[PDB]
Amino acid sequence: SLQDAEWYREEVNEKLRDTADGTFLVRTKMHGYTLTLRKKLISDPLTFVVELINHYRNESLAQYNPKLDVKLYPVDQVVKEDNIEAVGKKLHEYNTQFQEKSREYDRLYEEYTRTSQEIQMKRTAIEAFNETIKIFEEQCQTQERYSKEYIEKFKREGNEKEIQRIMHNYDKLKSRISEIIDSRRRLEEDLKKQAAEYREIDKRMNSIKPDLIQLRKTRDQYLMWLTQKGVRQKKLNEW
Amino acid sequence: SYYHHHHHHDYDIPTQGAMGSMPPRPSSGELWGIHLMPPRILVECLLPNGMIVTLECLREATLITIKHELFKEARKYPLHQLLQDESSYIFVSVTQEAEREEFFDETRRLCDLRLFQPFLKVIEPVGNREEKILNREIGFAIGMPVCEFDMVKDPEVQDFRRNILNVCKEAVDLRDLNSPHSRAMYVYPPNVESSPELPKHIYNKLDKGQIIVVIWVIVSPNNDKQKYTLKINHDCVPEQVIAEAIRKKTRSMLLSSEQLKLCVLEYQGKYILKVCGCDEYFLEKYPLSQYKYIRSCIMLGRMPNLMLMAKESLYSQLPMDCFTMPSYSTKSLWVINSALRIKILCATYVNVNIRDIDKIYVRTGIYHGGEPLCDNVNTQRVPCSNPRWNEWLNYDIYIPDLPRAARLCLSICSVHCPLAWGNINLFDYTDTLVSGKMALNLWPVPHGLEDLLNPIGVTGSNPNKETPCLELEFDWFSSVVKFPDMSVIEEHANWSVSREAGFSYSHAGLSNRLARDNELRENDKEQLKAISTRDPLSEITEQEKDFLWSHRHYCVTIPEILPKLLLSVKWNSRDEVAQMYCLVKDWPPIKPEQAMELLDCNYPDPMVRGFAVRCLEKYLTDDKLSQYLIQLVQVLKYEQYLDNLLVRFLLKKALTNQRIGHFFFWHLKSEMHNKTVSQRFGLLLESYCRACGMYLKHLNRQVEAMEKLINLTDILKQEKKDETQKVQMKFLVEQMRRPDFMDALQGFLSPLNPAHQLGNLRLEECRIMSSAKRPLWLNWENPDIMSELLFQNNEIIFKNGDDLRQDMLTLQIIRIMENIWQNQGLDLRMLPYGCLSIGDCVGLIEVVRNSHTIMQIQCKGGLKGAFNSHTLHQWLKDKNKGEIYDAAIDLFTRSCAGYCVATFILGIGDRHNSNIMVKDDGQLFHIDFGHFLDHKKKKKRERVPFVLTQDFLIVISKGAQECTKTREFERFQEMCYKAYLAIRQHANLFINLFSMMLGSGMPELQSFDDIAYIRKTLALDKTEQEALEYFMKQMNDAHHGGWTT
């Protein structure tokens, strides 16, 4: 009961990892047991191991050491299987289910980060189209100045021969502008199609994450329950 | 019967595993959307007269070649009379960064411009200072145009840009202090070991401390060079060696004894010592042994090969660095009588399954690394769709009890799992307390973080707009609320102490109360230093913290305790903090290897980090800086603001020293893809590039070379997959002969080591490896005068699609374990080859010549029919014959011992035939380390990854059978045990380095328990006598017998 005691460094953190503001347990001898409360590793009033821990499950640690206004959780399933070997199978099964689940999460975190980049590449490219266009739009306007000065000046000389090959050039110019804009439009629609898929990447990551933590969490207690009975740290590997 | 006739209906027939070996992508290359512009392309030339004349161009065609052809062709088009001479015009266009670059350097070729659409506009030179608009140089080196920073809102960014120039000028002024000597001293700093002191095994190669050298010289025209074969003391200096070499050069049968002496003086000072084969020099008075080049030559059984070189043929080669300033030149927090509250408003862009999740909320906290109050949430309101909370969140802490570097850490969550996150600094860069409205764009939950909130994560909003933008509101106190001056924090300390001296002794039952005023117990005074020794990663107990906090004034006796004390301060209690500030103000400096802890993510206070920089400023040699440079560039991330003391320190040392500069450039430019740090590092790299002198030109030529190879391999990996090596190789050689490649990939400096130059490309020795990552084995002619003395060929591997920085770090860690061991007087010879990441899964790996995977040794020595355990040993005898064999086994045994320990301690990947390498001379070394801290345990192994098969053991014990039981192997074991405890006594460092690396988004380093593996493996919770036995235990089970006593 003092050896057992339910609650009685490295693998304490991984059992305190992801627990509430209140959870605890107790752990060189030529140095000082260590209470490890999560919110804090922990004198004179020695009038009290199971004695001291019951006292402060009810009570806060505020009067002990000023800033510790925190008390609570002293931390079952496995289909209650007292089979040992059939608990051993389930470990591998959940461990395959968990490992299966991480790849799907890893795949998508890649696609997410490409789709972040690929998208942001697209954005800049549009800014570049828009600037490209603005230079052609300035050019079609640039030619309207000096061309229409070189229509009204002279006029008889060259005549339609001159203004044709000026008007053709000016056709080519605005029709190129037509292609570029229609090129940009087509990027922007591809952009929202990317952005659509991007939203859906997060969406399935956020729906894989919770199952990923439970699958993990079960598998931990399955592997606890085994290590409780028969030390067998070596038999676990194949699973 | 196999599958119980169980159909999987989902399994689709097509569909990755099928050629699954090349992850990272993508990019656009020499034109938009396309990797490599068509060999013959047409470009549209927008003239000033409005005419679009469409020139057929060659991809590789230079801008003058284009212009001269354009203006020939524009005579044939209308409005020709309107055009000037072709010389009164410059080219301009839109680039792939979407700016409008003017193309001033009309040597540049069309493919190298990074155009967007193939078009060029003609114009007249805008701005009389063209000179100034060679910022594009900087833009090219950084890889984002300078004009991008100019139109940034943030006053901090703008303030950093103009303020940091202080540093730039202070180092440029040091460079032209003793010019031309100092300029050479910048450019070619002395490449020296840390201590002049020599280890015994290096010394014993010296016959009473002497070395045979070779000093070469040249005469007329050059060509006949003449050896002069000195035999001088190891600890003599260059100026002495240059005399001896002139003495010898100029003794004669026509020169008296005196006449020589008077010849020696006039000749002595006009020369300096170069290493033959590379650009290294011996520019200041170090004992010769202490230059890295010698100490290798000693260790390798080589005779050093120097060169007398005139100072005017070296001050020839240094052009002027010539720096120019750029075109860009209240009420105290303690008054505020309220608590903290922060108003959450709405999160707009959250992407969740309504079918899968119930409810979503915002978790929030205040922090300092570890947190100043009970963490809160808010109510689980308007879940999933339509999600808003209008709630003031109520934080149990008064507003004067926020520490200077206080930080809000928040996250949106589901029910328990996080969706997004983002952290703000509760103060701004000008000390000013955050008030009003802030729109925080969020960061996606990483792989490693299961924890709800992520407080180690980066300070500020994601730039990526299309993510969860959670907007919020901060309380307003009718003024900018500013943090106290230090004159005021001082005063309040000098009071907090004076008041502490008048409390009752009844009150000394507080326990954070040093009632043992100036006198103390010897048990106490000893139990403090017992803390001091403990590694950073052993958590400290409230009792110990309080125990420290009270005795803080005795803690100045043990400077080294400071990290433990600092973590023992209640940062939520401004009395405690103002006092600690006053200790730190004049606390005795400490060793960098300990002071570097204080720049990690658990010490964010600016007073602390300042004390830490001050330590470096004193105790950190430029040798020791470049050693730990990675960990320093990494730790900038953990600074609160852009402008700070560490950035100025590094910026200065980098502009002081062009070797540090070199790696400092690439380590920043490496991480530029990462939007956590693009802004910070972008701005810093501007300042570097602006002030680094001519190296900006050298970097650009390296930078351009790396891009060719990036575009080339990006093609090889995408269009050219599913083609014969033959096909790809015929495409790679086709490409590399193009003159734009020939220009871009020849005369330039190895980014692995800018000492080596690269010169001509030997294409017949260039080839793609087998690997489906499609790495290029590239091979250059060393164009040195004395190439033949060092290596006639330089060859290094460019590997697209692999995250080099894990490897990078493990190699650096090994490199350190070596230096640790060898100064310890335990010669174990590791070969930490060069590795450099230049980008997002793009990098360079050094080729070690004359080395093979155990596997080739076994394929080459493999008998015709269906390999032999001896073949390694037989292949090694084959090479080393005579008393050469005896010493080659000593090398294999010396390396193989050390590599066993490093590997075990780090817990790098499982080793085997195709990642273990042996050299002709008999050295062993490991390659491709993969996951370093045991990253496959996420699916108490305390694994042994180097497990010594028969193969190795045979070779260790000459040729014996039952190797287990030789002296040969008894010796080997003793090496391993001595190495292991060596590293165990420096484990504070190895922890600290690994801590400092959490900054990079390496998945293997997400938080401290990742690092905690390196406690177990070193067994730091135990005592060394059990450590040993633990290691021996560990090693024994992997080998199936051998290891006790």
Ligand SMILES: Cc1cc(C)nc(N)c1
């Ligand atoms: C995991 C952890 C916890 C605390 C209280 N402080 C750290 N520096 C790290």
